[PDB]
Each structure stands twice: as C-alpha cells, then as structure tokens.
Ligand binder design. Structure first.
Ligand SMILES: Cc1cc(-c2ccc(O)cc2Cl)sc1-c1ccc(O)cc1Cl
Ligand SMILES: Cc1cc(-c2ccc(O)cc2Cl)sc1-c1ccc(O)cc1Cl
Lengths: 10, 234, 242, 10
C-alpha cells in the first residue's frame, strides 16, 4: 500500500 | 495527550533531542557534476533523510497522538518544506552556499547543470541569508520545523493539532523572552519567523513541480518512497 | 516616509478606508453553465478586481515609498493570494459556499464543473471555515491582506537595494504591532495575543499554497485556450513562469 | 512597459 505506512509503524 | 502538559523548557529539550542526523553524500571527487549525477546525489540524499524525518516526526510532541492516516497526510504535505528548512538551517554559516551535506557544499553556478534549479537555489540562499541576518537560534529552528510539520497539511484534512501549535508558539515566545527581547521585539520576531514559512511553502511548491517534471522524464531513478511522497501532491 | 509615523489606530483606519469595492460578476442565471463560461466568469471578475487591487496597493502604507520596479514585483507575486484571501473573507458567513460576487455564490458541486477546481474550492472553503471559527475581524483581515502584499515577494527581489527591503520589514513590523494592538483591545491576554497572531500568520502559508496551485491551474487554462484570459491576467501569469 | 507598470504609474 504505502512505504510511509510501514516506516511510521516501523 | 501529554504534549500539552510539557513546560516550555521541556518542549525545547524534547525537540532538540529529536533532531535527525546530518547525513553525507557520496565521496566521489569527480567534478564537475552532470545533470544526471547532480540529481542522483540530491535525490539519493533526500531518500535517506526521509527515513530519519519519519522517526523525528514521531518524536515531535503530539504527533504520536494522531491517527496513522493523519500522520501520513502531514508528512506527505510537508516533507519537502522540512528538507528545505533543514538545508537552509545548515547553510546559515556558509554565505552564498548551500550545505546539502558536509561533503556536498554547492554554489549557484553548480545549480545550472540542472534546468530550473538555479531558481530554487537562489530562493534557498535568500532564505538562509534571512535566517543568518536574523541570527536564528537552534532552539527557534526546531520550533519552526515542527510547526511546518503540524501546520502545512492541517487545512486539507485539528483542534488537538491547533493546541499543539499554540504550545509551540508559547515556546517560541519563551525563548525570545529568555534571550532578553522586549515584548514588542517578541511578537515582531515571532511574526518575522512565521512569514518566512510562507516562502518555504512557496519554494516547496516550485520544487515539487520540478520533481514531477523529472518524474515524467524517467532519467534520474527516483526511489519508490520518493515517488509515493511526490504522487501525494498530484 | 509617513508609514512609520502612524499609530496603530491610524494604521487600521487607513487600511479600512483603502478597502476596494465588492464587484459583481456577469453571471446570467438563464444561461446554462459550461466549464468555459463558468471559468470565464471567474477570470473576467479577477481582471476587473485587479484594477482596484492596484489602486488599493498604492494606499497601503509604505507601498508608494518603494520603487516602481519593486511595486510591480510585489503585486505580480501576491495578486492571486490577495484575491483569494478576499474571497474567503467574503465567504465567511456562507458555510459550504464561496462568494466570488454577490450574484455568484458557488459550492463544490458547481466546482466539479471544471477539471481541477474542486481541489482548489475545498482548500478555499477550509480557509473560510478556519476564519469563521477564529471569528476573524475586519480590522485583522485588512492587516493580513497588507502583510501578504508586502511579504510574498520580499524574498525574491545588490547594494542598498537593501534599505528598500529593510523599509518593507519595518512596515511589516508596524503591521504586526497593529495586530497585537487590536487583540489587546479585544481583551486577550498576552499569551492569547501571541497565539492568535501565530494562528493568523500560519494561515498565510496555506493561502500561498492555494495561490501556487491556482497559478498552475491557470497556466493550464492558457494552454487549452478555451477560457479567454485578459491581457493583464496573461501578463500576471507569465511573471510566475519567469 | 507592462500593463501593471502602466496602471501603477497612472
Ligand atoms: C531532493 C532534492 C531535490 C531538489 C531539487 C532539485 C532541482 C529542482 O529543480 C528542484 C528541486 Cl526541489 S532539492 C533536494 C533536497 C535534497 C536533500 C535535502 O536535505 C534538501 C533538499 Cl531541498
Ligand atoms: C480568477 C480565479 C481562478 C480561480 C480558480 C478556479 C479553479 C482552479 O482549479 C483554479 C483557480 Cl485559480 S479562482 C479565481 C478568483 C476570482 C476572483 C476572485 O475574487 C477570487 C478568486 Cl480566488
């Protein structure tokens, strides 16, 4: 979905 | 949200400790740069800075209290502004130059290799010069950067965010009162600092268009992360 | 100069007296709406408003003290921001609606009329909602609009060639003082004053954003050559292209 | 010169 999602959730 | 309970000094210390590292570019001494090489170094650098920015954002008081989607919206809207004010801050003690990295200090002549970069270069230099003449302090810088994070996307979704914004304003005034400024000088400087944010927004907007323009050329390889951040503005 | 010799109340009265009139659009409720005609209405209106804005800018304290070249540059940078903050101010009492003119009141569904405008409409509506919840005062509005004119282009201008930019900053400081004066007069504590001042100036960042996006839409409108743009407006558009 | 220049002049 979004890389940004992963980075924010770690 | 425990962000609102913090004192002004606690707010300052929290933000200072959250400061992301200063990253380096490549150590290849091959000069001068080509358009492809220049863009390569700049986009590679930003891609790595974005990862640290996200961990910085999560450490900005009040940001953790937001839902994931809201956190995403704010970073998507403000990521280039945040990179720019960081760049501008780093370049303060280097008049006429921009310090992208300690091993990547550029002048405006080196911006002509890529078309339409001199425009933004000159704008960035102007901002940096303005900060220098204002004698911007690190404590003020981190307040401004956090303000950009919380404010830039807040009207395109808020009361919690506005309350955190208010506390950063209180912090900024606290710093100025601490530096010996009079009441009149406090709101004047506060105003001067916030008006510069309008210009940082302007630079980001010009910057985003050029990045998109180079996205349509498929010359410089943009990372998937950079592409997704860019796509959010289209 | 006389801009630096004004009291806060005198600054306010000068700005209020200089307020441009509210113009009407050529909106004909019998004529069916099309994207060409609808956009023609907005661009025609802006063109006529530009003439009044120019003569309004002359009455902004400190503006005539600048060189003709500097005046030109400031207006070229700020004209759409100034139109927009005027629009959102007029629209405050009309939730979910944008009052472009007394006879032209639009919501977002009539924005879909035009490719790209819905996003701009939503941003403008949100700005107007923000002004409404802040209960923006007319005295504060005229201060903010003068700030936009003087600030938006001040960082894109040598020698001295510096005292000119330094003059603008002194006038800007005077307007900041005026804003604080208004808020203290309204019964705000010092903390509340600084907070409201911040809240108001941060909105200017969003107005800049809307203006940037708007200019891109407009430049797009020039390349379609379906919406007729006036010569002044085209010359305002090309200034951002350079 | 420019139209804006003209209008500002008059
Ligand atoms: C990634 C990136 C791309 C930039 C750029 C280059 C050319 C242009 O026309 C337009 C633009 Cl926006 S500038 C920049 C950057 C990279 C790292 C950093 O810390 C700060 C910045 Cl502002
Ligand atoms: C001339 C003009 C063009 C507008 C517009 C509409 C859709 C869009 O995507 C982009 C744009 Cl820029 S809105 C506008 C305007 C006209 C008169 C006035 O008092 C205020 C405004 Cl903001």
């Amino acid at each position: 979905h979004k890389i940004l999602h992963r980075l924010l959730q770690d | 949200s425990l962000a609102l309970s913090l004192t002004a000094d606690q707010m300052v210390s929290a933000l200072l400790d959250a400061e992301p590292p200063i990253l380096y570019s490549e150590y290849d001494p091959t000069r001068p740069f080509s358009e492809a090489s220049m863009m390569g170094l700049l986009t590679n650098l930003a891609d790595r800075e974005l990862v640290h920015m996200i961990n910085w954002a999560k450490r900005v008081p009040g940001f953790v209290d937001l839902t994931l989607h809201d956190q995403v919206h704010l970073l998507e809207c403000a990521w280039l502004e945040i990179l720019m004010i960081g760049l501008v801050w780093r370049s303060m003690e280097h008049p006429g130059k921009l310090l992208f990295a300690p091993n990547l200090l550029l002048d405006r002549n080196q911006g002509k290799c890529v078309e339409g970069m001199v425009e933004i270069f000159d704008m960035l230099l102007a901002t940096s010069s303005r900060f220098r003449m204002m004698n911007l302090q690190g404590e003020e810088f981190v307040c401004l950067k956090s303000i950009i994070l919380l404010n830039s996307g807040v009207y395109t979704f808020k009361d919690h965010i506005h309350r955190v914004l208010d506390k950063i304003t209180d912090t900024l005034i606290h710093l100025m009162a601490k530096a010996g400024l009079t009441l009149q000088q406090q709101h004047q400087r506060l105003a001067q600092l916030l008006l510069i944010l309008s210009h940082i927004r302007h630079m980001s907007n010009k910057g985003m268009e050029h990045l998109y323009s180079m996205k349509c050329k498929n010359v410089v390889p943009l990372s998937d992360l950079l592409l997704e951040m860019l796509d959010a503005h289209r």
